[PDB]
Ligand binder design. Sequence first.
Ligand SMILES: [Cl-]
Ligand SMILES: [Cl-]
Ligand SMILES: [Cl-]
Ligand SMILES: [Cl-]
Ligand SMILES: [Cl-]
Ligand SMILES: [Cl-]
Ligand SMILES: [Cl-]
Ligand SMILES: [Cl-]
Ligand SMILES: [Cl-]
Ligand SMILES: [Cl-]
Lengths: 328, 334
Amino acid sequence: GLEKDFKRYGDALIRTTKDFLNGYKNDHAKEIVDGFRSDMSIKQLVDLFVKGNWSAEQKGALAWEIESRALKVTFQNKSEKYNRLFREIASAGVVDAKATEQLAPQLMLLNDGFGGRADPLSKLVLVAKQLENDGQVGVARQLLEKMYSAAAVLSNPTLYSDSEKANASKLLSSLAAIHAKNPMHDTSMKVWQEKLEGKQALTVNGVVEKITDASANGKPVLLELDAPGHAMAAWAKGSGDDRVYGFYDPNAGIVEFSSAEKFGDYLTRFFGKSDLNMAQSYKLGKNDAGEAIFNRVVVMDGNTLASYKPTFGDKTTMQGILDLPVFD
Amino acid sequence: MGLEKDFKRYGDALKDIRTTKDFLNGYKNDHAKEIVDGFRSDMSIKQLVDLFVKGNWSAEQKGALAWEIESRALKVTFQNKSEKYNRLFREIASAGVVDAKATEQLAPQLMLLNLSNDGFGGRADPLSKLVLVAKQLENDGQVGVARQLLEKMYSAAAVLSNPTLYSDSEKANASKLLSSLAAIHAKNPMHDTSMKVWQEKLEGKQALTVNGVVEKITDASANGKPVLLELDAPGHAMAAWAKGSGDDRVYGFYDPNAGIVEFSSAEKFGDYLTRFFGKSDLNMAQSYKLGKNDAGEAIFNRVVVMDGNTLASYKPTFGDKTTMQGILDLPVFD
Ligand SMILES: [Cl-]
Ligand SMILES: [Cl-]
Ligand SMILES: [Cl-]
Ligand SMILES: [Cl-]
Ligand SMILES: [Cl-]
Ligand SMILES: [Cl-]
Ligand SMILES: [Cl-]
Ligand SMILES: [Cl-]
Ligand SMILES: [Cl-]
Ligand SMILES: [Cl-]
C-alpha cells in the first residue's frame, strides 16, 4: 500500500523554499527529527510526517527519507542474454541501419588489411572531432557504423545494389589510401603542430594535462598517441558544459567524458598498473623517472589534416572521406 | 606483409571503370572462378594482383578479380569488446557527480529495477506510456526523446541517492521528475473519461500473439504514421512501436529488462520479438506468464493501440498543467 502512503504525503504539502531543500539530504533526519529510526517503513515515515508539527528543514529531512525510498529507481547492467539476442539479429543477413547504431559501440576492430596499427582510424577520428567542434554531430560514431556497413557489404555483395557495393569499396579503399600515403610524410602541407618524442616524449599525465587544459575552452585539442605497432587518439572539443574529453583505441573503442577529472581517472587507470596496465601491454618505454611514455604524441592541426587528400589525382579530402555514404 | 605495394599496383591498374554497371555486376563472390581463366580460390593477394595487371579483362571480369582482391585486402573484422573495458568505463561513470556525456554511453547498457508495490507500480506502467509519447514526438521531428528519458531518470536517481553532491535546484528537479512517474501511476490515463488516450483494447477472443503484434507494428498500411502499442502481461507492461517514413522508418520494442531496441528492418524486428518470447531462445512469454489462445499460442493479456496525440496532451497531476510531453522535457541539471 505504498500508493495510498504517497497520496497522503503529497497532500500534506514549501518544496521549493531554500529552508526545505537544505534539510532535503541523507543522514540528517536522525539528528533533527525527534522520534525517527532508520529502520522505519515508508508507512511509518509518512505517519511521523503527517502526525507532527515540523519546521521547513525538518519537513525536508523526512521528505528525503520518504522520497529516497518511495521514488527509488535502481539501475544495473543488462543481462548478457538480452545483448546476445540483439547482436545475433543485428549481425545477421542484410545490414540494419538503425540496429548498426546500437551495435557499433559494442564492437572492437581487429588487424593484413591496412596498417594493423589503426594508422588511418586514429587520424580520421581526430578529423571527425575537428568537424564536431565546428558543429557537425556524431561524425566519429558514424565512421565506425559506416566501416561496419562497408565490411558487411564487401562480405555479402549479392545482398546489395551496385551503388552500395561502389560506396563500400570507395570508403574501405580510402582507409587503405591514408595508409599508403601517410599524411605525416607530406611536404606540401604540415598536418601536425608538434611531434613529442625522445626527451620530449609525454607520459599519460602529460597527455591528460594537454587534453584537459582549461585555456583551450572552445578550441579542439587533437592528439595521436603512438605505441609500438598500435595507434590511439585523444581529444577535447566543444565549449562550457558541452566540452567533452575523449579517447579512442581499437580495443576499447570511443570513450568520452564531460568531466576532465573522470577523463584523467580513466586514462591513468587504463595505462596504469593499478588497473588495466595497458601501458605495459602496448609495450611503452619509460622516461628517466621510470614513468611510461608514448613512442610519439602528435599534436595535430585539425584544419590542415581535414583538407589533406590521401589519393593523388582524386579531390576527396579526409573530411570528404568522413562524409562518404554507404547506403542511399 | 607486402600487401601495401600490392594494393598500389592494383589501384594504378584502374586509371571511372569502378562505377560502370558492367564492372559492379561482376563485383560479387563465387563469380571469378567462372569468368576469369587462370583463377584459383587458393591464390594469395599478390598472385591475384599479378593476374589482374598481367592480363586483358572485360568490365565484368575486372569486377570479379576486384572483389576477390578487395574482399581480402580491405577486410575489416569486428568482435565483442572485452568486458574489462566496459567495467572500467562503468566504474568511472558511476563514481561521484553524474557525468552528462558519460551517461549518454552508460544509459543504453543499464536496465531498470524497483519494488513489487513501488511508488509507480512494479509493472513499468508509466514508462511504457512515456516511451510511446516519446516515439510520437520523435515521429513528429524531435530526436532522442526516449534515450534522454532514461538518461534523466538515471540522473534523477543518482541525485536522490547522493543529494549532498548537487544544488537545491537539482534536488528539486530530480524529485519533480520521479514524482511525475508516480503521478502517471496514481492517475492511470487509461481510466480518464475526459479524453480517450487509446484507439483499441485487443483482449479476450481478440487478444494478439507475438506474431499478431509484429504484423500490427510492421503493417505497411501505416505509411509515415506512428504505431504505438502497450503490451500488457500479468504485472508487467512493455511497449512496441513504428515511427518515421521510408528508409527512416524504425520498428522498436521496450522492456525494463531488455531496454529500448529498434530496427530499420521489419524482418529483423519480427525475428527479435519471436525469439524474445519464443521457447527457441529467451522464452520470455513463459517468464512473464503469458496465457495461451485456443491454438496454444502465447497471447498478451491486453494490447492497447494508443493515440500518441491524445496521450501526449494528458495531464497526470490534476490542477498542474504539466502534460506527458511536458514530463519528457522536465530538466534535471542547470
Ligand atoms: Cl548471383
Ligand atoms: Cl570536472
Ligand atoms: Cl549511409
Ligand atoms: Cl569492356
Ligand atoms: Cl562489474
Ligand atoms: Cl544551491
Ligand atoms: Cl489498466
Ligand atoms: Cl498468429
Ligand atoms: Cl535501453
Ligand atoms: Cl538534463
